[PDB]
Amino acid sequence: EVFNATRFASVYAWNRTRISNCVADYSVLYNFAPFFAFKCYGVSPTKL
């Protein structure tokens, strides 16, 4: 529901959602996007 949206707000008002009380398996994040840039800084994507 953060990648299936239709109206990702403009950068002047960046919509910000809080993710808590759940289990994160980022394979869904992987298969919902033909990625162009996955630059992570604090944590490496592989063991995420």
Ligand X SMILES: *[C@@H]1O[C@H](CO)[C@@H](O[C@@H]2O[C@H](CO)[C@@H](O)[C@H](O)[C@@H]2O)[C@H](O)[C@H]1NC(C)=O
For residues 2 and 28, the answer to whether their CB atoms sit within 8 Å is: no
Q: How many amino acids of this chain bind another protein (CB under 8 A)? A: 7
Q: Which candidate, 21, 13, 41, 40, places its Cα nearest to that of 29?
A: 40
Under the binding rule (CB under 6 A), the answer on residue 4 touching ligand NAG is yes
Q: Which is nearer to ligand NAG, 2 or 48 (CB)?
A: 2
Q: How far is the CB of 32 from ligand NAG (least distance, A)?
A: 7
Which residues, at least 6 apart from 26, have a Cβ–Cβ distance to it below 8 Å?
45, 48
Site residues, another protein (CB under 8 A): 30, 34-36, 38, 45-46
